[PDB]
Amino acid sequence: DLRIKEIKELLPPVALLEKFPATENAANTVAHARKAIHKILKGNDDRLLVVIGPCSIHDPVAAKEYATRLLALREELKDELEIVMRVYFKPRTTKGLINDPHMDNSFQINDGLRIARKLLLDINDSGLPAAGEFLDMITPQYLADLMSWGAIGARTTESQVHRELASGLSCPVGFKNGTDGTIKVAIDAINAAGAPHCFLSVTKWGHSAIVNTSGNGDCHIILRGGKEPNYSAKHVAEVKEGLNKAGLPAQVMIDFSHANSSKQFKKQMDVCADVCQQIAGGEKAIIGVMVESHLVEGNQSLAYGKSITDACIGWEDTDALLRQLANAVKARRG
Amino acid sequence: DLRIKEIKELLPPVALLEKFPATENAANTVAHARKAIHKILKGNDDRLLVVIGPCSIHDPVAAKEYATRLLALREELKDELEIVMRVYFEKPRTTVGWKGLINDPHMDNSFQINDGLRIARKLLLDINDSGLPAAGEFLDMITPQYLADLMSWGAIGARTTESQVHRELASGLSCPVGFKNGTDGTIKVAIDAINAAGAPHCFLSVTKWGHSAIVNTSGNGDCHIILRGGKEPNYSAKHVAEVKEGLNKAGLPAQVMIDFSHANSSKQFKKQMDVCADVCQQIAGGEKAIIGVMVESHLVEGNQSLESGEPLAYGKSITDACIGWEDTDALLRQLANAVKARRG
Amino acid sequence: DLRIKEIKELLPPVALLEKFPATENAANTVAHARKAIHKILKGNDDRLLVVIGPCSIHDPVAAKEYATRLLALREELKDELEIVMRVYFEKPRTTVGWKGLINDPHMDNSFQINDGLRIARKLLLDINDSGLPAAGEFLDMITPQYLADLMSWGAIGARTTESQVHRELASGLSCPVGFKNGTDGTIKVAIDAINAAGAPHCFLSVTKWGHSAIVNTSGNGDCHIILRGGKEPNYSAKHVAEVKEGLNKAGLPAQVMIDFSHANSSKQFKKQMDVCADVCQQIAGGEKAIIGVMVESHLVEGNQSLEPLAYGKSITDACIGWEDTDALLRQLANAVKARR
Amino acid sequence: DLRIKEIKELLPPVALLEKFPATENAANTVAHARKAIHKILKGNDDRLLVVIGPCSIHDPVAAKEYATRLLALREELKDELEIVMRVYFEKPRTTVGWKGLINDPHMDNSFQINDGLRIARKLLLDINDSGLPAAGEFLDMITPQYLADLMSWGAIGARTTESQVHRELASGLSCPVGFKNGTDGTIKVAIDAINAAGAPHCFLSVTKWGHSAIVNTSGNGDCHIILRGGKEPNYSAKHVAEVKEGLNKAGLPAQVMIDFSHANSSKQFKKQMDVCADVCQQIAGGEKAIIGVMVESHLVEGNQSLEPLAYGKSITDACIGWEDTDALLRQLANAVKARRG
Numbered sequence A: 001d002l003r004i005k006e007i008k009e010l011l012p013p014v015a016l017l018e019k020f021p022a023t024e025n026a027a028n029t030v031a032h033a034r035k036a037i038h039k040i041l042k043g044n045d046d047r048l049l050v051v052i053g054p055c056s057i058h059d060p061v062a063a064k065e066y067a068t069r070l071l072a073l074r075e076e077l078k079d080e081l082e083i084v085m086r087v088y089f090k091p092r093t094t095k096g097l098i099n100d101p102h103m104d105n106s107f108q109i110n111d112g113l114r115i116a117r118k119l120l121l122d123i124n125d126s127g128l129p130a131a132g133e134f135l136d137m138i139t140p141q142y143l144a145d146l147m148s149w150g151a152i153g154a155r156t157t158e159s160q161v162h163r164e165l166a167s168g169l170s171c172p173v174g175f176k177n178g179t180d181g182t183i184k185v186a187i188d189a190i191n192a193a194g195a196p197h198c199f200l201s202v203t204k205w206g207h208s209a210i211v212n213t214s215g216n217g218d219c220h221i222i223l224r225g226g227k228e229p230n231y232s233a234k235h236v237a238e239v240k241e242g243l244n245k246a247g248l249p250a251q252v253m254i255d256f257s258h259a260n261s262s263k264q265f266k267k268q269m270d271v272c273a274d275v276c277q278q279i280a281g282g283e284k285a286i287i288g289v290m291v292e293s294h295l296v297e298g299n300q301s302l303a304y305g306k307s308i309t310d311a312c313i314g315w316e317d318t319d320a321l322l323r324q325l326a327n328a329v330k331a332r333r334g
Numbered sequence B: 001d002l003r004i005k006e007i008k009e010l011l012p013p014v015a016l017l018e019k020f021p022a023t024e025n026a027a028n029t030v031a032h033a034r035k036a037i038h039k040i041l042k043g044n045d046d047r048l049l050v051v052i053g054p055c056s057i058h059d060p061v062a063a064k065e066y067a068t069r070l071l072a073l074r075e076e077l078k079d080e081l082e083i084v085m086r087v088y089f090e091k092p093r094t095t096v097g098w099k100g101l102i103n104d105p106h107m108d109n110s111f112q113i114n115d116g117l118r119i120a121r122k123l124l125l126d127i128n129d130s131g132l133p134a135a136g137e138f139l140d141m142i143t144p145q146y147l148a149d150l151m152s153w154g155a156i157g158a159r160t161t162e163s164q165v166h167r168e169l170a171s172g173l174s175c176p177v178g179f180k181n182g183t184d185g186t187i188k189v190a191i192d193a194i195n196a197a198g199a200p201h202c203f204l205s206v207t208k209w210g211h212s213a214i215v216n217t218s219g220n221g222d223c224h225i226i227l228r229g230g231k232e233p234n235y236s237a238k239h240v241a242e243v244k245e246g247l248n249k250a251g252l253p254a255q256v257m258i259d260f261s262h263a264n265s266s267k268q269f270k271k272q273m274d275v276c277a278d279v280c281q282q283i284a285g286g287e288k289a290i291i292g293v294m295v296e297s298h299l300v301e302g303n304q305s306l307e308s309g310e311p312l313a314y315g316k317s318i319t320d321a322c323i324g325w326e327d328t329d330a331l332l333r334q335l336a337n338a339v340k341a342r343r344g
Numbered sequence C: 001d002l003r004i005k006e007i008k009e010l011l012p013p014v015a016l017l018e019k020f021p022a023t024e025n026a027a028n029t030v031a032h033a034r035k036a037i038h039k040i041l042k043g044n045d046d047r048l049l050v051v052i053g054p055c056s057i058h059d060p061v062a063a064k065e066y067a068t069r070l071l072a073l074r075e076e077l078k079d080e081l082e083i084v085m086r087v088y089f090e091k092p093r094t095t096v097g098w099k100g101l102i103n104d105p106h107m108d109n110s111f112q113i114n115d116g117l118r119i120a121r122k123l124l125l126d127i128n129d130s131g132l133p134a135a136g137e138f139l140d141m142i143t144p145q146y147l148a149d150l151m152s153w154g155a156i157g158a159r160t161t162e163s164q165v166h167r168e169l170a171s172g173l174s175c176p177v178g179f180k181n182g183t184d185g186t187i188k189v190a191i192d193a194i195n196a197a198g199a200p201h202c203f204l205s206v207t208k209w210g211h212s213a214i215v216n217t218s219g220n221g222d223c224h225i226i227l228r229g230g231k232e233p234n235y236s237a238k239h240v241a242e243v244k245e246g247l248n249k250a251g252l253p254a255q256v257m258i259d260f261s262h263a264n265s266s267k268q269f270k271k272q273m274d275v276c277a278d279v280c281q282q283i284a285g286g287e288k289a290i291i292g293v294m295v296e297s298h299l300v301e302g303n304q305s306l307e308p309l310a311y312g313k314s315i316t317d318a319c320i321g322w323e324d325t326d327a328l329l330r331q332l333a334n335a336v337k338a339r340r
Numbered sequence D: 001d002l003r004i005k006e007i008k009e010l011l012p013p014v015a016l017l018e019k020f021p022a023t024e025n026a027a028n029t030v031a032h033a034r035k036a037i038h039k040i041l042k043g044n045d046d047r048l049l050v051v052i053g054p055c056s057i058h059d060p061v062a063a064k065e066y067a068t069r070l071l072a073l074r075e076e077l078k079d080e081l082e083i084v085m086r087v088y089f090e091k092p093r094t095t096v097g098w099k100g101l102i103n104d105p106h107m108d109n110s111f112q113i114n115d116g117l118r119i120a121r122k123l124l125l126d127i128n129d130s131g132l133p134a135a136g137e138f139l140d141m142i143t144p145q146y147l148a149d150l151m152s153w154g155a156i157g158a159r160t161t162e163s164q165v166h167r168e169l170a171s172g173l174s175c176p177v178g179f180k181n182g183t184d185g186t187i188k189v190a191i192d193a194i195n196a197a198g199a200p201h202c203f204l205s206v207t208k209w210g211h212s213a214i215v216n217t218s219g220n221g222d223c224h225i226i227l228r229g230g231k232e233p234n235y236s237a238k239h240v241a242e243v244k245e246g247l248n249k250a251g252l253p254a255q256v257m258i259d260f261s262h263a264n265s266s267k268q269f270k271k272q273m274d275v276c277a278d279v280c281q282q283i284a285g286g287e288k289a290i291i292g293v294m295v296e297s298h299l300v301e302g303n304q305s306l307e308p309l310a311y312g313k314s315i316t317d318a319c320i321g322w323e324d325t326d327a328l329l330r331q332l333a334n335a336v337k338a339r340r341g
């Protein structure tokens, strides 16, 4: 191992599960939210899953405020929406509160893991479900029990080892379309993750083992745009067709940011209007949306509660956007 | 965990390394081939790296018979070619299917992975001890520790070139690594991968004791692109030119390995010979940037399916279709002739 | 194999350390007690180390009441005694028997060892957090990692003073250690033990991650003998002088700790009061070699057998009750101020 | 941990079991030998168990030559003697000296314990594969995992016969276990240890994977005392009588193994033949409680201090040499024949 510089010890998942066990409150939040998203995916609930929050968590304090503001609207709009905080601990092409909690290249990953599990625990304990991005094959063991929904990143949707992981997660999973607008790799990923798999993974004890999964049927596509936005009713039509042709539920989640916002946080409100019109009009296929939002709109490379990663919408727009979606949902229902 | 049906004990890497230590000659094979490829990547040698052999290993008997034949050509053609055999134990599937010898050596969904690891490492050991270096695809995050000391070159497949955990893996590998262009032909994901892999990373991984740990890598500078086509093949001079400029633009060496198979053959195995003819004219006409090729070859041409029912023919691929030995011998001589012409 | 019926999962030390980390107070209590005991063993403190408490812990409830009472006397008699509570979570049996709180916290042969570990470390942590140092017997080769950071002093049982693995264990322990004389009163075994424990060793052990490893220790100087009688008691100033002679002959400090129980009490808890008088007579009369004493004390004197159990009474060896305990500590604190 | 200087990786047992797997020959040797000692310990065989071999192993080559010679005798005398080779790797020592083959295979204080474990297991494997059963000493709780599958009989250190942890270990051992009498000669501890060891236990151990776990044992019924002397030898008929007596009271089979060396020979290797003569008298006279003997034997008698060393000569305690060993074994066989008819 000439290219390995150092090897340092890592707390087994059991260490963090023992220090920060799920309270009865937290367990209930996870259970109910998973259950509620399953009902939506099976078409037995006309409500809309709303996964919304910062692009990346970098300050537990700002994150807990956001969680309290969001919890309020979650309880206010629960008849129309299943609201889940985005708590993302990040894929790049050149990387998180877990991988470097002190954001200083000290890579205090054990501390990062402690900070992240506590935050997720605290959010779930309040009654707010959480959502995460699963990029690593080892980290999920420390956090998955506090996750009600997760996303496989667009750069890993085609990866066999991430489809294996998805096939064994206890929460539903979204797969993003290709960095070009194509759905095939995401349809393939849903089909793969739906099947059982046998593969090597690290256990709660931190040792490697052979695991066998059952397959995950709570997997769905996420429309994130390509060279052009793909949230319009024309694109929704195409995706639904490609899903029926593949034998999958004609369901989609629409990501209002990234390629779909044209890379302009403000445009997420445009996507919202468009999407609300489709739902208000009777589009039952849109079962969920994803929105990058924070306390303060904008970005930075530190202001309190403002993103250090992608640019997000602020709280006022967030409140607005969330009521629009809840109103679109009543129109589709009554 | 409720979608986790069962958990089973897994031999740690140390137990495989102790049971199957590298011989002196196997370690010499690995060290010499890695150095030789480094020299080609450095432009300090005009030979061509040839990664050639089965799509997937499913039969140690046929693999060793194939290795003997390839070794004889490796020795005959070594002034021109650095021949490394494809010993691929891990297959990425488009959706589902047999994932290779390690995941399921009995090819019947018994998933006897401890046996698969023993079988795989013994075969790699035997092949290297004979003097033939080996190449593999690094797909799984945990299997590399069982095998990497016997690998002279590795590939990251097109479906994982964008994957951060695969780029992290390459930054700590002791062998040179090729990154495939994207399944749609995109070159940029591979240039980014090479740059990512050239840098040090700190990430979670598993040690030779089978325990997760925090690891720090130094970056791997022996990485390069593999052209494997997109919607259309991308082996022709026009494409090699675009890729050279893209690489230089990003501050990387302007050099490529060309996969004759997969989308560059439109998945028609005999078309590898057409790619070969075009690439040999490129090399013989003076193209120095083509430092390597990849070819899917076996003893018997074509392929067969485990789902057919028909008994398995010996020495015939059960994954992608491959050229047979006769075409393989003729292809290798074509490449060696072209490298010689490029030189004179 | 044939005589192994089942194997079950065991939390690694790092899981106990993370859930139940030392508070600053706990870290203080342990640090100072260790320093304090060190100063006594280097003969720079005239005080007496007193290792007193239940024979075994079986009830964090009764154990917590005791710790409050003892802590009061530790703070009052602190100028003469260094009080350290017995918190024994594991017990060596003569043949078989309940092995202590860790091995079987529910005293019913259910061997919920993971709960035992949790229960034991939370208690140890609270006792320390309150300011009361703690002592234990290090019997198991694997449990020490879960508890030793909360131990101010440790003991190697008489039936293991001669054990290589235990002598090795003592040489890497962060706390002072005492070796009980042989069960038949033999003093040599413990002198040898002290000497080994003081040297470095290289041996196999289990790390804080639950993994076996090769360990090198530095050797432990802060080790001493513990007199606990043999075929008859051996606490009398005659025996003490003989021991101080072997210790000198052997090159070691002529220092001793006296256990008023086990063989020195003929297994009769009340005779611990008798031994207290004899040793106080030696200490008031000038004996500067008695650096410590061990006493089996509990809330309610006597002992009971193992369904509902009587509060405050030992399920292992018989102990003196709290009444006798408070007088005993005042007897010792009186003998010390005399020597000074 | 402030008195902990360093921590180094240790190969897990599975790593050595994979590298050096029991052959079929080796497995049968262990199984058959373990079965034959059970029968002897159940009064169902009248043959004598003979654990004999070097005080400790420092040279696998000499050890293999010794094993070859003993194997021949083992076959020649099989109707009378169940001959098991002593394969011990260390001399437990209260003062410093060579730490044995596993601890320090290279005899230079380099503590190449990984090297030692490999050497030690490969030796036990080779010996068992040849057909010769092996006996070992269990001194710690971790090394047995790497070796016990090739052990047909085991002994607990005399300094740890009273230790609960070693009694727990014996309760899970797959081989019969001998327990040594106290150093002053008393048998109470070996009786307590037999009782303790015959009971099921639950305790923490390291597994084949090198991880700690909770284990439960069934208890070991094939345990017995080893007479190794006190202040005075304790092999004579008078002493056997006392021990048979105390065993019958404590509810245990009145049977013993007699260690001819150490205190029973006044630390004089040649006097193992004096003990042999006496024991052979007792046995040929009908004594049936003597189910076994332990002898320290090597190719070349005596010992040497650890530059080239003498081949086949102990570097720990002094042993009888091969000529005395062959004669001792024939003495034992001949007595066994007299006790029966």
Ligand SMILES: O=C(O)/C(C[C@@H](O)[C@H](O)[C@H](O)COP(=O)(O)O)=N/O
Binding pocket: B055, B088, B091, B092, B093, B094, B095, B096, B097, B137, B157, B158, B262, B319, B320
């Ligand atoms: O080995 C290589 O160089 C590869 C991997 C390739 O062999 C893949 O595993 C099958 O083409 C998938 O086959 P399916 O599409 O049937 O899953 N290049 O892509």
Ligand SMILES: O=C(O)/C(C[C@@H](O)[C@H](O)[C@H](O)COP(=O)(O)O)=N/O
Binding pocket: C055, C088, C091, C092, C093, C094, C095, C096, C097, C137, C157, C158, C262, C316, C317
């Ligand atoms: O705690 C101590 O200091 C000890 C241990 C002592 O408490 C022992 O555990 C019981 O006497 C066993 O009792 P039994 O003899 O019933 O197994 N000293 O010997």
